Symmetry: C3
Subunit: 540 residues, 3 copies
């Protein structure tokens, strides 16, 4: 089957010389192409995209003076050795110095007072307390008494954060941010600090958007926050570094975009401790006693959130995108074929054109549909075609007769490409077995009148022995047969001559049923000496 | 070429009125559509997805009492100022106090004893030691001697972590987790704490799955771990916050899912220090000497792993997905066309239907294949068609003759749409040049018998001068020619009349080869007065 | 419309028995299939990919001796309790001990000297200073005077980092890295340490590439850096853990790849403080005074960057990819159809084949194009076809005549499938209204000569009453009509007989325009007794 495989199958097409459909087809082609090109370029769908790998190094600069005598805060005093994605700047603080692990009364709170030891419970762990009770109601001061606890003593008082913030001059502090980013898939590395950047720059949204030295108060202004107010209880501020990087040589750009967003929830419910603070202890020994200064530090935690993508041209990405948009170029074909199949219907003239006469020249689709689509029937064993000489159409009786004569069984109308049922006076009763008799109980005409076998052309197109012999010799020029063999060939050829004449197409002539008058006239002209006639047999 | 471009080409189609193929085609259309719709909706393939940008703020609450007198541990004692993605809770500890940078003997280990200075090596750095040897085997105690080292003295003893853990009451500690998440591409921000959440809630997998206050022991229970056992040597616990967020207005939901997973490897080999611990020093001065208390802290490091995606409807994402699934609607066409092309073969009746008679009504595909596919031959210069009057088929001799007469060169069988090689007694030797003689050495019949030129229709269809003149005038109604011009046109028309009659289609009649008898009978009826006959020439 | 929906439409195709096109079609099919398969397998486009969730635990090991007497540095002295994605190793340091919050002169800098109090400014905050000026120029030493500041005193001197680094023996330190990774979507967890790994291993790029114990100097060597030189001022070193993980059972592999990259910028401008350092303070009390030792620590920050993807087979991913590459199998059809449509043009023989005769056997595409494409015209109301008996082509006059006789209005040439304008002497003036007269002002021939109505076949094909009656009876075998009805049917049938004869196809015969001579000869043979002749009317 080497020749069976080496074959090419091409579609048969009808090329229409129509300027309307040629223009519509090309207009739809540009619309699809314009959107496909726009989607590819705007979304960089030809690029293989990769998340960024970031490293952040921060350096805070600034000195603070706190009036309380005067204490100095440099970077070692309000910051911590961490210089990565997060750094903390202390803006407020409460101190409780000289704490010793011993027994002491609780600080008087909203419910920390007691009047008897029955109120205190030994081993109890008050969620708002920093010690474990011993069940003793010792005196805190002269006025009131509080339950004794095991804790660092004296316990930290429920003192609010100072207002204004002790280190609110941190607004004028600056942080330098060094961001190293990398794309391991594309093997590309860059940093946020350009060689042109000087140390005297400060970030501005419009004047210096690439300087990575930020004033803290400027950061808060750009986020819509008030540094002075947030400094009292603290908060979390997000410094977002966005990297939209194009690594293609012809459109190369890998630069950061700086934005600022508060990550603290200012509407935090009071039970969740709004703001940002933590407690840390400075441990020291004094008089052979382990002492501790406890500091509740308020301030801003700055989170450096670095995100972004690096794209570079990928051939496989482009191939996948192009293949995923190739089917959209069939839109013009779908639309115009729908127009052809829809405007070729008979309800167009019946119930559309009289209303709207602007659509009148769309009758050309009836011609287009004729040249495009050919309808065929499934050749089932019960497929029958009936033509009546007194009718302009052809009936298709595709159902089983079930003993009803074919004359009375009406079928679907199809355009042409002595017995009780007889209406011409020439038909004869079927000589088939009684089960199949209803097939041959067909007349040449539906309504009474002249028989078709009495027409001039019936003797010329069907019964002429010379013409049938000429057709037989056209099939086989050197043909010698006996009378019995010749009669059978002439009889079967006369059936086809009637079927072709009255039904036109061989598709319908194959399942055409001869009327009884015509069938028996043919059988009289070319008789069968011995045996009975088979009748119509299913061609498949 | 304005009219050349403004054209529309449509496919020629055969519409089959078959309920089986119409049902199969629609059933396959629903199957493709059902899967395409299901894949799009279940996977949200219409959405542009974005990784989350997360910020975590944690607050641990709890007080611990350690029995050793009694020491108090509050958050400043077992936690560190870090409150981001990681926080540490100390659950056990070993202390070595009053260390001084001086010379001291090594602690007695499995191989730290010595009996001579030759065992010790000056400057040696034992991997299991905390000092550098000086080559001297000083006495540690009365029983044994150990190598002298430069270290903080005395060196920390090889003491195991206490069992049970000193701060195993950390099981009852709680952590509040504040998670701020953001989708910069979609510009959406939310947090894990809803306004409905109260401070008295505790997380439960089924009762309070949205409360972000977690008991540490509950975290360990939900991970399948035992807090009490892990507390002795420490470990790493992962708190996973998963954000499956739909940002479409009609299906909006952005809420976290909490899961817990141990990140420590409990099956760690002993050389890799299983558990979690670190050594830190509390530095202080005493008697003008730089002293240090060294603490080996065991405990749980909690990692807050926040991940997830935020999806919102994207038109370009939907267009790409739809275009990438449009080709699947050709599946019905492919399947039914395969059925038509396969069940139309002759081996169906030969070796399939006798076995299985259920497939018998599939003979309709032979009719479908006839109305769908037309087979044509490549018109190569060696393409020849031969018809023998005593055969029912037509031979295609597509090979070069190479001096073998065309009568004997057998070719592929194709259905019809005096010389030694002669078998009819009427053929004449070719008058062509000897190289091309084998072309015209063809008889009308394969086996001996009557010549086709003696048939009645040969004189009527091929030789009739009146009919050929009528055909010529049909071509050109007003045609005047001399006898030499008329004879040439009549002779060439008689070749085509024979070729059309004996081969049917003009595709095969173009390459049909006339038998010598017919060719010379035609040339006798319409002779060429001067010159020689060209013979058959390749039409392309 | 149950039968209207249950229909199947198949394309009509031409199957070409060509080995060249069959081979080209299959070769292009393998090329598309080979690339589609290669792209799918190399890029794992059948897999659903997921970013990794990582947890890192590090442990640094090593002791350092610093010569300054001799001070010992163990992990508590050069590292910090952080053991996650970042750890710091101190390699150099400058100490300023015994600092007290008081008033002191500034350290003499390049511009810190003063000669009068007018130079100093009270409250000034020098960016290079660690205090706030009080406007007083106190003496620092005997030689020079500096402005008094409020700071920790004495202020840290502008001392360079020691060279060589004090803790450059950190080169021989080792870090053990434990990496737990997870794929929450695929529910897969693994770690970087295999059970086969022993504690005596050290990482080597080729000898032990899976051991996660790294010498720091080896890390710097693998990054192309010098640990000894970087140790003086510090730097940031990236340890990259790449996880290319295949989670399919038949190709399972999830192992890390270790690479090293310096994240510090060695070419940093001096104003941005190149290297890596931070200042931290050791707070202590002495003589009831809050004292502090300030250390400027230089060293290497190591960032553990863990990235990667985990892929597992996804059915929806495969379906989307296959559907997005199905349209590429139409490439063979597009190419071969382009070959057929292009090599069938007449400029091939005119201006291509004489130059290149290798392309000569490509004339078979003219035959292929004939069997594939049928061209039809849009049936517009101004569509006219004209045939002249003295011409070999047929003119298409698709434009409006606008009073110009159809004889003179030339149209496009189309191959056949008494009055002043008359050139045959038999034409008659039109009897139509004057506006439409130009339609019927057409002669049978362009140039003077014999009329076509004087031909023998005109009386046989057009005027023969017997033949027209036979055609009428073929339409309707039992037809009885009056002379007026018979004449109208015979006249209209004779128009079609002329149009079919002279134009061939019914597509062109529908819009064919009869010459005046033929029209009036037909109207003379079959006259209209009463009324006037309608003439040609638009068939649509
Ligand atoms: N289409 C069609 N074919 C028929 C009809 N009647 C008979 N035939 C065909 O005639 C052939 C032989 O039928 P018949 O002459 O009655 O049987 P026979 O005398 O034994 O050969 C069969 O192949 C039938 O297909 C008819 O009404 N319509
Ligand atoms: N198909 C076919 N055509 C033939 C054959 N023999 C001759 N012809 C055609 O007849 C035409 C003229 O051949 P011929 O009459 O022998 O040469 P002429 O007398 O010089 O015109 C050529 O165009 C041939 O294509 C044949 O056997 N088969
Ligand atoms: N194609 C074509 N059809 C024509 C021409 N002239 C007349 N007819 C057709 O002839 C039919 C009747 O025209 P005519 O005999 O002149 O009018 P009538 O005598 O009133 O029936 C119309 O349907 C026309 O389509 C012609 O030149 N070309
Ligand atoms: C009557 O049918 C003749 C009309 C000829 C022009 C038809 C134009 C129809 C409008 C375009 C329809 C296809 C586009 C559909 C949207 C993609
Ligand atoms: C004989 O061929 C007649 C059978 C008519 C119904 C054919 C049904 C075949 C089963 C469906 C085949 C196409 C689906 C293939 C799987 C996608
Ligand atoms: C003349 O046209 C006959 C040539 C027969 C073989 C044609 C081969 C052409 C080369 C292949 C063209 C299609 C591939 C285009 C690149 C994808
Ligand atoms: C910030 O600096 C400016 C100018 O140096 C000063 O006017 C302002 O008071 C400062 N803000 C704070 C909060 O100290
Ligand atoms: C910031 O908040 C403080 C209160 O702490 C207020 O006095 C000040 O006016 C605010 N600044 C602005 C610009 O609103
Ligand atoms: C946790 O608390 C419960 C009730 O307060 C107590 O019974 C239990 O012993 C505690 N667990 C530890 C480890 O302290
Ligand atoms: C947890 O481990 C401890 C050992 O440290 C054991 O005594 C206790 O029974 C364990 N708890 C459970 C629930 O298994
Ligand atoms: C590292 O160790 C080797 C061998 O122990 C030694 O020779 C070398 O001097 C050491 N390097 C440093 C910087 O101490
Ligand atoms: C590393 O740098 C030091 C300078 O600090 C230099 O002495 C040494 O030779 C360098 N090592 C190499 C291998 O270049
Ligand atoms: Na497609
Ligand atoms: Zn009858
Ligand atoms: Zn009848
Ligand atoms: Zn012969
Ligand atoms: Zn012969
Ligand atoms: Zn004329
Ligand atoms: Zn004329």
């Amino acid at each position: 089957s080497w020749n069976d495989v080496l074959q090419y199958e091409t579609n048969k097409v009808t090329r229409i010389q129509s300027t309307n459909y040629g223009t519509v087809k090309w207009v739809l082609h540009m619309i699809v192409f314009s959107y496909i090109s726009f989607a590819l370029v705007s979304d960089k769908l030809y690029q293989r995209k990769e998340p960024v790998i970031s490293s952040v190094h921060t350096k805070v600069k600034g000195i603070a003076e706190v009036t309380e005598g005067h204490s100095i805060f440099d970077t070692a005093d309000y910051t911590f050795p961490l210089q990565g994605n997060s750094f903390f700047v202390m803006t407020n603080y409460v101190k409780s110095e000289g704490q010793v692990q011993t027994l002491c009364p609780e600080y008087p709170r909203r419910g920390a007072q007691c009047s008897s030891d029955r109120r205190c419970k030994k081993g109890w762990m008050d969620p708002q307390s920093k010690g474990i009770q011993t069940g003793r109601c010792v005196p805190y001061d002269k006025t009131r008494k509080t339950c004794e606890v095991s804790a660092w003593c004296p316990t930290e008082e429920e003192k609010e954060a100072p207002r204004p913030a002790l280190l609110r001059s941190a607004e004028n502090f600056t942080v330098l941010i060094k961001n190293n980013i990398h794309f391991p898939g594309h093997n590309y590395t860059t940093r946020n600090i350009l060689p042109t950047m000087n140390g005297s720059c400060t970030f501005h949204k419009t004047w210096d958007p690439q300087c990575s030295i930020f004033r803290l108060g400027d950061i808060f202004q750009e986020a819509g926050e008030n540094f002075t107010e947030v400094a009292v209880q603290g908060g979390i501020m997000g410094i977002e570094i966005y990297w939209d990087c194009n690594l293609d040589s012809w459109s190369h750009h890998c630069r950061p975009r700086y934005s600022f967003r508060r990550l603290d929830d200012k509407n935090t419910d009071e039970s969740f401790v709004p703001g940002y603070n933590f407690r840390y202890a400075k441990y020291y020994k004094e008089n052979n006693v382990e002492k501790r200064t406890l500091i509740k530090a308020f301030g801003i935690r700055f989170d450096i959130l670095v995100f972004g993508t690096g794209g570079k041209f990928d051939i496989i990405q482009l191939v996948v995108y192009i293949g995923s948009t190739l089917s959209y170029f069939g839109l013009a074909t779908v639309c115009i074929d729908l127009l052809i199949n829809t405007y070729s219907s008979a309800f167009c003239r019946s119930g559309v054109y009289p209303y709207c006469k602007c659509c009148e020249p769309c009758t050309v689709n009836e011609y287009y549909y004729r040249k495009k689509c050919e309808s065929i029937m499934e050749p089932k064993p019960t497929l029958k075609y009936v033509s009546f000489v007194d009718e302009p159409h052809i009936r298709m009786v595709d159902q089983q007769l079930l003993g009803k004569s074919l004359q009375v069984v009406k079928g679907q109308e199809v355009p042409r490409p002595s017995p009780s049922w007889c209406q011409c006076g020439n038909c004869l009763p079927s000589r088939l077995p009684e089960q199949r008799r209803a097939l041959e109980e067909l007349c040449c005409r539906r309504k009474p009148g002249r028989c078709i076998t009495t027409s001039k052309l019936f003797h010329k197109l069907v019964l002429s022995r010379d013409t049938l012999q000429l057709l037989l010799l056209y099939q086989d020029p050197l043909l010698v047969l006996g009378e019995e063999a010749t009669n059978s060939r002439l009889r079967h050829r006369a059936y086809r001559c009637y079927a072709t004449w009255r039904f036109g197409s061989q598709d319908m002539a194959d399942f055409a049923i001869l009327p009884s008058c015509c069938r028996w006239r043919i059988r009289k002209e070319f008789p069968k000496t011995e045996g009975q006639y088979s009748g119509f047999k299913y061609p498949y």
